[PDB]
């Protein structure tokens, strides 16, 4: 159930059930990332865990 | 071990601390229900490392106090900079300006000229015969 | 290049506010999002930090924001801290657990949801001491009114004057003229001696 | 089809089956008492 | 936990990491270079 | 520079808990000495017929010892849930929390 994925690869029952589901998650989406001598870091630690980071 | 074996073992020994939140007292379950906090998210035997849990308990603990926050960037183009998308939604604090140093196992290149220079260099020495 | 963050008043305020939000973090059922159409960065050492917090309790959000702001201006001179305080709309003599003028002004964003939508963003010049970078933050929170307070306080702290690092290095272009003049003048002195 | 009549017909067909069919293919629609207790212990639907 | 293996339970002596990264690294020999340049200048100006 | 060195091999309960009400907090009980408390109730002990009875500590030292040792609080007594009496014990637990 991804927007990038083409819907010809799912049955119609899967296609109609694709938009009505709930995603309680924590996501990062970047459409484009051109790095020129850069150091990108896309971390998402999101569920409540130990505060201290090793 | 399989879920059925887990159930059989824990029914054989219902007082074992290893299996105490798979089959907790109704008191704990209803305290958790009446607090709007499911018991498996805070009850200590569930948090125990050696505690044995079935598939259902695991896949319900995996949704314990999970937030719903998303970041949707577009066309990002950075030069000579740093990008730090954190999207952090919990008590954990990201370590800002924490320089992560690794072991640079650098391999030192040596000043070895390509030994194809060896004949030509000899020719250089040879031209001393022009000065004799 | 792994460089340290150049600490600056608004950066300290934002980080203290974020730490206070994290240490009072509470689960919520509201969806908080950041949507930036374009991000353009073309200047060196222009660090960008997109932190997505969101606390549904906006009253506690302003409480922690005012507490962090007070702790920040605890090092400024008395006249400057006070004048900046009336410029923002926060009074030191009032307890942080009280509704201030800034909160009243920013309540006009209660109806809108806690989403940060930027059509296009570009990072300007970031002059930093060598070994450090100027870091810019885009912080979301669980209410657009807490966001209102956040950007207004950030702008007020940006209004101060911090001396800039001036670059004295000349622009570099391939100097064949110098070696050419050297060769020509070597020929000249050879002719002069001869 | 996702209409009311289609859903009623689906339920009718699936409930007019024999015991063997319900035991082999429809164990999810007829959970045991233990699974009912486990679902009562939880908050999400049993099918999750 | 998609980056759980990159963090170490034991404390990390990052100062020792930097000391080792400097110990085992290329050494620009500015002392030798400067001495050789001074010798070259003295030989080309005074000796010759 | 950077963050201080961390030893994850030693476990801290306060690291995991992000809500102050969930953390166990020994408090003064006017009824009998001191007793542990939290949003889930008071730490209890096994009764003769698998009943729930709250432990009583004569001094803060015993509460500090028992609450924060390596033992696990299997038994939890909540006056607002288990008996559903909603007596002065429930109000006391609400005021403490």
Curated annotation (Swiss-Prot), chain A:
Most cysteines are linked by disulfide bonds. They are created by the viral disulfide bond formation pathway, a poxvirus-specific redox pathway that operates on the cytoplasmic side of the MV membranes. It comes from the Viruses. Induction: Expressed in the late phase of the viral replicative cycle. It is found in: Virion membrane. Envelope protein part of the entry-fusion complex responsible for the virus membrane fusion with host cell membrane during virus entry. Also plays a role in cell-cell fusion (syncytium formation). Belongs to the orthopoxvirus OPG143 family. Part of a stable entry-fusion complex (EFC) which is at least composed of proteins OPG143, OPG147, OPG155, OPG086, OPG094, OPG107, OPG104, and OPG099. Formation of the viral membrane is necessary for the assembly of the complex. Interacts with OPG094. Interacts with OPG153. This is Virion membrane protein OPG143. It comes from Vaccinia virus (strain Western Reserve).
UniProtKB/Swiss-Prot annotation, chain B:
It is a single-pass membrane protein. Pfam families: Pox_G9-A16. GO terms for cellular component: membrane; viral envelope; virion membrane. Residues 1-111 are virion surface. GO terms for biological process: fusion of virus membrane with host plasma membrane; symbiont entry into host cell. The keyword Secreted does not apply. Belongs to the orthopoxvirus OPG104 family. Envelope protein part of the entry-fusion complex responsible for the virus membrane fusion with host cell membrane during virus entry. Also plays a role in cell-cell fusion (syncytium formation). Part of a stable entry-fusion complex (EFC) which is at least composed of proteins OPG143, OPG147, OPG155, OPG086, OPG094, OPG107, OPG104, and OPG099. Formation of the viral membrane is necessary for the assembly of the complex. This is Protein OPG104. It comes from Vaccinia virus (strain Western Reserve). The gene is OPG104.
Swiss-Prot record, chain C:
Induction: Expressed in the late phase of the viral replicative cycle. Disulfide bonds join 32-54, 46-126, 106-148. The chain crosses the membrane at residues 175-194. Its main location: virion. The keyword Membrane applies. InterPro entries: Virion_mem_poxvirus_L1 (IPR003472). Residues 1-174 are virion surface. It is found in: Virion membrane. Disulfid bonds are oxidized in the cytoplasm by OPG088 protein. Unglycosylated because produced in viral factories instead of the classic ER -Golgi route. One of its GO terms (cellular component) is viral envelope. Coiled coil: none annotated. Keywords: Disulfide bond, Late protein, Membrane, Transmembrane, Transmembrane helix, Viral envelope protein, Virion. It holds the Pfam family L1R_F9L. The keyword Transmembrane helix applies. It is a single-pass membrane protein. Signal peptide: none annotated. Component of the entry fusion complex (EFC), which consists of 11 proteins. During cell infection, this complex mediates entry of the virion core into the host cytoplasm by a two-step mechanism consisting of lipid mixing of the viral and cellular membranes and subsequent pore formation. Component of the entry fusion complex (EFC) composed of OPG053/F9, OPG076/O3, OPG086/G3, OPG094/G9, OPG095/L1, OPG099/L5, OPG107/H2, OPG143/A16, OPG104/J5, OPG147/A21 and OPG155/A28. Except for OPG095/L1 and OPG052/F9, each of the EFC proteins is required for assembly or stability of the complex. Belongs to the orthopoxvirus OPG053 family. This is Entry-fusion complex associated protein OPG083. It comes from Vaccinia virus (strain Western Reserve) (VACV).
From Swiss-Prot, chain E:
Belongs to the orthopoxvirus OPG086 family. Unglycosylated because produced in viral factories instead of the classic ER -Golgi route. This is Entry-fusion complex protein OPG094. Disulfide bonds: none annotated. It comes from the Viruses. Interacts with OPG143/A16. Component of the entry fusion complex (EFC) composed of OPG053/F9, OPG076/O3, OPG086/G3, OPG094/G9, OPG095/L1, OPG099/L5, OPG107/H2, OPG143/A16, OPG104/J5, OPG147/A21 and OPG155/A28. Except for OPG095/L1 and OPG053/F9, each of the EFC proteins is required for assembly or stability of the complex. Induction: Expressed in the late phase of the viral replicative cycle. The chain crosses the membrane at residues 28-48. Component of the entry fusion complex (EFC), which consists of 11 proteins. During cell infection, this complex mediates entry of the virion core into the host cytoplasm by a two-step mechanism consisting of lipid mixing of the viral and cellular membranes and subsequent pore formation. The chain holds residues 293 to 340 of 340 of the full protein. It is found in: Virion membrane.
């Amino acid at each position: 159930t991804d927007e990038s994925r083409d819907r010809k690869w799912l049955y119609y029952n899967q296609d109609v059930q694709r938009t009505r589901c709930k995603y309680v998650g924590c996501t990062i989406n970047v459409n484009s990332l051109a790095l020129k001598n850069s150091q990108a870091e896309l971390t998402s630690n999101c569920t409540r865990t130990t505060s201290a980071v090793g | 071990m399989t879920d059925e074996q887990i159930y059989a073992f824990c029914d054989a020994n219902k007082d074992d601390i290893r299996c105490k939140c798979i089959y907790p007292d109704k008191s704990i379950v209803r305290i958790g229900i009446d607090t709007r906090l499911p018991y498996y998210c805070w009850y200590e035997p569930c948090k125990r490392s050696d505690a044995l849990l079935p598939a259902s308990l695991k896949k319900n603990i995996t949704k314990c106090n999970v937030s719903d926050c998303t970041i949707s960037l577009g066309n990002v183009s950075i030069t000579d900079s740093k990008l730090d998308v954190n999207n952090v939604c919990d008590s954990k604090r990201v370590a800002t300006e924490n320089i992560a140093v690794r072991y640079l196992n650098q391999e030192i290149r040596y000043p070895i000229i390509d030994i194809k220079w060896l004949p030509i260099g000899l020719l250089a020495l040879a031209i001393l015969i022009l000065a004799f | 290049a792994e460089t340290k963050e150049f600490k600056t008043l608004y950066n300290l305020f934002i980080d203290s506010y974020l730490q206070k939000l994290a240490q009072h973090s509470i689960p919520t059922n509201v969806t908080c999002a950041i949507h930036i159409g374009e991000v353009i960065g073309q200047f060196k050492n222009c660090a960008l930090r997109i932190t997505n917090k969101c606390m549904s309790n906006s009253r506690l959000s302003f409480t922690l924001m005012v507490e962090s702001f007070i702790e920040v201006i605890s090092l400024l001179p008395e006249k400057d801290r006070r004048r900046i305080a009336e410029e923002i709309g926060i009074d030191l003599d009032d307890v942080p657990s009280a509704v201030s003028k800034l909160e009243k002004n920013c309540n006009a964003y209660a109806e809108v949801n806690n989403i940060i939508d930027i059509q296009k963003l570009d990072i300007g010049e970031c002059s930093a001491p060598p070994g450090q970078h100027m870091l810019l933050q885009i912080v979301n929170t669980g209410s657009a009114e807490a966001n209102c307070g956040l950007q207004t306080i950030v702008k007020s702290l940006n209004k101060i004057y911090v001396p800039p690092i001036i670059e004295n290095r000349l622009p570099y272009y391939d100097p064949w003229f110098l070696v050419g003049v050297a060769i020509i003048l070597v020929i000249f002195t050879v002719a002069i001696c001869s | 089809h996702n209409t009311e009549d289609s859903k009623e017909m689906i339920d009718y067909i699936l409930r007019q089956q024999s015991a063997d069919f319900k035991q082999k293919y429809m164990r999810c629609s007829y959970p045991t008492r233990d699974k009912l207790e486990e679902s009562l212990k939880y908050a999400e639907p049993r099918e999750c | 936990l998609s980056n759980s293996d990159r963090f170490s339970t034991v404390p990390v002596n990052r100062a020792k990491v930097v000391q080792h990264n400097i110990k085992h690294s290329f050494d620009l020999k500015l002392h030798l270079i400067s001495l050789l340049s001074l010798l070259v200048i003295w030989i080309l100006i005074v000796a010759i | 520079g950077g963050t201080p060195a961390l030893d994850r091999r030693v476990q801290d309960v306060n690291d995991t808990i992000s809500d102050v009400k969930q953390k166990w907090r020994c408090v003064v009980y006017p009824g009998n000495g001191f007793v542990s408390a939290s949003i889930f109730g008071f730490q209890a002990e096994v009764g003769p017929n698998n009943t729930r009875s709250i432990r009583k500590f004569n001094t803060m030292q015993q509460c500090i010892d028992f609450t924060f040792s390596d033992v696990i609080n299997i038994n939890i007594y909540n006056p607002c849930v288990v008996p559903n009496i909603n007596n002065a014990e429930c109000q006391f637990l609400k005021s403490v929390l």
